[PDB]
Amino acid sequence: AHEQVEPALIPSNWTSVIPLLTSDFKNQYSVISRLKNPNMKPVPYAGDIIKLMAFINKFSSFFHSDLQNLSFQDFEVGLDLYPGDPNGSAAGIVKGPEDTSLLLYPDFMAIKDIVYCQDKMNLLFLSLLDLTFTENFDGKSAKKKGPLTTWENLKSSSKKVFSNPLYRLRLVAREWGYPREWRQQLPSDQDISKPKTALFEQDEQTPVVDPSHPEILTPNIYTWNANEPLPLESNPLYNREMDKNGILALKPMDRVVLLRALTDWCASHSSAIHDEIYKLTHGKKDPVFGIQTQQVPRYTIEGVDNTINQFKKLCSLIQSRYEIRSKKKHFVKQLKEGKKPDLSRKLEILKEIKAELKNAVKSEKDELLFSLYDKWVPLFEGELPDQPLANPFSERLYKLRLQEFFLGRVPHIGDFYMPRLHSYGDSLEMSTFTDLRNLQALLSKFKNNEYNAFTLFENDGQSMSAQFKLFYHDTPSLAHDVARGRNTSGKVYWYELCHDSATLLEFLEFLDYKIVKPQDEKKETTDNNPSINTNPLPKDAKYNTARKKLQILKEFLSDYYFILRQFEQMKVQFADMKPGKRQLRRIQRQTVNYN
């Protein structure tokens, strides 16, 4: 080139910790279930619930404090929801290895708590309601700094605590569109919707009024049997129990059904959130990588390694692309006047850290990254807008479409979500939703016992729900299902994999079994146990790409563990209780005896 044309600098390629799924990574079907194991309870309501949380999450501002501490569990106990049965719920839960008999939540935990779990759920109920219809408060009204629906609302002796709102709903029931469940399946098993039934005019027309313009636009009019609800005699929406008795009124499952449809309803009429999703989407700048169905973070899909590896590859490219421009005729002459604020001084801040490159020994290259990161930031201005090593949960755009529960995805197997909790706004002290750089360390300290649940607690630790669940989601299947004819109706694509510390291990340990590459090509686990969980992964190229990803998943979950574990323990030791100034001391102090 003339003056060696600067190396190509593609922004999209260097996704700001936000690739995307396009749900086409699966144009190869693999609904296969080779991952059978005791810690694999197929739960239908799994999906829906995630919705709930995620919805609350991406609207952290529009809910009370306690409303943001919910965990996938909290819901379960709250609404007599038992995982396992692929038909909806499942009264009971097998306790222990050998035990055909089952247990309910009362038989299980403590009754006080069970109440709480309910109370919360029902709070969320009126919450959503007031949020939807009672949109008289456009954010800055009678309740500026403080979500509209508060606890004191749910503990008013007023007869019609729910009736008034509820009433306003049924008024717009049909209009809003009823949920798939609450529709009276076409009283005939002959009708569809692409075809209509009511043949209005018996015959059509032939010799029409205007000869010269035979345009017979409407040969005949028909009628459409549209999605109608149920008779008020069997339409849960009109359940009189709810009126003066919260949401517990509906059957365990139906409770969920309403909740879900309630969320969708909210963000489609709410003079609040719906009006806000606009300001989110219609932002004044679209993502370099483009607009998609769902976006996720880089390290979620590239593994902890490459997410940094790519960074090195880049943090070095930009160095050249700067110094080839820095060593340019036109540019050098215009530094005697300051061509730019940054694009003048940033040149300088390079040669100072570059002298620190060849500086110390060679074995300390692992130092540059965690020693120059902060002083490297300024450089990512005159070039890329946003880059790999960033925090996804701080930029408008990278939100609405970003599912903050993605933990990755594995070829010919599927996606893996972990329904967490609070993730945006205030109290983001111990959120695992952060810059891979931060996250990396923030997790690390827990693995080393440098950060106890105590510390977790001292910094708004209650902000994050403790309990959690892992989930395999058969996106591959649910895809080839829709893509071929949107058949779905009563199927399942959601599965529980664990629900606490040790369980996670039983899964982690379980994981390896697949990651293991059958070196048994040079021929020529426990016995009789693949009766309750098959292990070996299919030895063949196509399933290599799988292992590699499966590996990182383990790696992550393995690190995640510690912080997760502590969360559980936290809610066990503490449980809603401010630290304070006169109390904080005594609190931590008690651990000096503990040790």
Binding site: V209, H213, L217
Partner: protein, 287 residues
């Protein structure tokens, strides 16, 4: 003898502004009458009586106007032939005593909306007006004499417009079929990167777009509940549980995106759906 002390006569037929479309020669009668009735009573003509032929602020054409109309009423050598009175009777039957103005206003509209020649679809929407037959009876008559109606210019260029709005859709219907009949695995492969979008915030994903069409194809363009439905179809397909935005679009906003999408595909087959439409065979006219 008859004592009728008045001032003016009745120099005017009927209010033909509400012309129920009747033999134009029937006005020549109500004037042959107006005049005869005049002298039969005696009520002398005056420049004052010159209201229909007014439009004059005291010029010098009025010098004869009065004395002219005068010797046209006084000179009424035609108090209606016994045959004329026959031509009278017969013509005032051929007319449309029934139709009025509310029957018209509502007619003309639907007569363009529910089709153009789709009588039944427009007649039915005039039940209190007059029966299916009674409607058609005005039908052929309407076009037989469309070129003879007050403002027939304006009243037509509104019917045609509601037609050009209907054909435009029905044509889109087809265009959607063709494009779909093309892709074996539409949900993935189907795309129309020719008239997509320029510099606009493409809130909807290249994918979502696809979906919304595949459902438009599911229920077919029908200017009815179609977009209301697809919204449900969205709310149903669990693949978009988390695509909050997608279910954050009302059947309205959602619909809008459609009217865009459609038109996009429209500017893609109007070069083939109009040429393939041009070649339609008949009895003695080969294309």
């Amino acid at each position: 003898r008859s004592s009728t002390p008045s001032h003016p006569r009745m120099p005017k037929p009927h209010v033909f502004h509400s012309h129920q479309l009747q033999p134009p020669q029937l006005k020549v009668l109500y004037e042959k009458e107006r005049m005869w009735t005049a002298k039969k009573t005696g009520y002398v003509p005056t420049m004052d009586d010159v209201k229909a032929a007014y439009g004059d602020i005291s010029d010098e054409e009025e010098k004869k106007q009065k004395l002219e109309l005068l010797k046209l009423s006084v000179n009424n050598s035609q108090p209606l032939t016994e045959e004329e009175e026959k031509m009278k009777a017969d013509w005032e039957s051929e007319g449309f005593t029934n139709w009025n103005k509310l029957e018209f206003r509502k007619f003309i509209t639907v007569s363009g909306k529910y089709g153009r020649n789709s009588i039944q679809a427009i007649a039915r929407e005039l039940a209190p007006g007059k029966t299916l037959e009674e409607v058609r009876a005005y039908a052929k008559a309407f076009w037989s004499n469309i070129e003879r109606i007050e403002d027939y210019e304006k009243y037509l260029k509104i019917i045609e417009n509601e037609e050009e709005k209907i054909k435009r859709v029905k044509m889109q219907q087809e265009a959607l079929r063709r494009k779909l009949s093309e892709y074996k695995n539409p949900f993935f492969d189907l795309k129309l990167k020719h008239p997509p979008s320029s510099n606009n915030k493409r809130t909807y994903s290249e994918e979502e777009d696809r979906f919304i069409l595949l459902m438009l194809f599911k229920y077919g363009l029908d200017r009815d509940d179609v977009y209301e439905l697809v919204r449900d179809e969205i709310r149903d397909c669990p693949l978009f549980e988390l695509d909050f935005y997608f279910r954050s679009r009302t059947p309205v906003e959602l619909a809008r995106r459609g009217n865009t999408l459609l038109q996009c595909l429209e500017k893609e087959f109007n070069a083939g759906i109009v040429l393939d439409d041009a070649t339609k065979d008949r009895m003695k006219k080969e294309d």
